[PDB]
Amino acid sequence: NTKGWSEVLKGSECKPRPIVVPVSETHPELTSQRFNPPCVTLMRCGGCCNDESLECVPTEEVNVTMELLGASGSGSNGMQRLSFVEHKKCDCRPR
């Protein structure tokens, strides 16, 4: 059935939301290597602000460590614990 307006609004608000991001882009300094999985889900600020002059931006972040399959010291396949920025709070702030 139909989603009511309150539910629709709550689903479009500026808040942290999961987003799939390429791991290489989160760690550009780890060059000449591949990551498995090559993508991760990170909590990032997302949604719509009620005004064209506002953007949905983080007001609180956190670092989280994820174990991925990447490269070892020899460039072989090996596990890597890497750190990622997640957003914990967000706000509609002027540009």
Ligand X SMILES: *[C@@H]1O[C@H](CO)[C@@H](O)[C@H](O)[C@H]1NC(C)=O
Q: At its nearest, how many Å lie between ligand X and the CB of residue 24?
A: 20
Judge whether 39 and 20 are in contact, CB under 8 Å. yes
Size of residue set near a second copy by CB under 8 A:
36
Q: What single string gives the DSSP state of each residue in 29-71?
A: TS-S---BSSEEEEEEEES--SSTTEEEEEEEEEEEEEEEEEE
Binding segment (CB under 6 A) for ligand X, from list 15-23, 25-33, 35-43, 56-64: 56-64
Q: Which positions touch a second copy (CB under 8 A)?
A: 1-5, 7-9, 11-13, 17-20, 22, 36-41, 46-48, 50, 62-69, 79, 81
